[PDB]
Amino acid sequence: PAIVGDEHYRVAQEVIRILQRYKDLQDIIAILGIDELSEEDKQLVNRARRIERFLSQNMMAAEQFTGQPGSTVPLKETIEAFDKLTKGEFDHLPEQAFFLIGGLDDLAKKAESLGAKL
């Protein structure tokens, strides 16, 4: 918190906590399925899948491999977007909408292309 500030540190720690819990629950989901998780754990699993997809990004150097031009996200936008994600504000969007995009504008455009409204 001293260097990056309280907001950045808190958002990063929340993201790490959610991803750690999802990693813990992956085996249970694989064997018994998601339907046997508590409602809060189902919510966390959905949030974690969206977060892990959103951590991916189309890179400038990756175009040669995908044909998609790269993107850059400012730090403030990243912190705000992951704060929103950790609160479940994008839980209604499909997880595929979060895959290989930039900021929240890219998320909205891709969600619209996939039939959902951000």
Binding site: D24, D27, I28, A30, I31, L32, E36
Partner: peptide, 10 residues
């Protein structure tokens, strides 16, 4: 082993 332990607990 970790996966089996979690499954056992559940």
């Amino acid at each position: 082993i970790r996966s089996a332990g979690s499954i056992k607990k559940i």
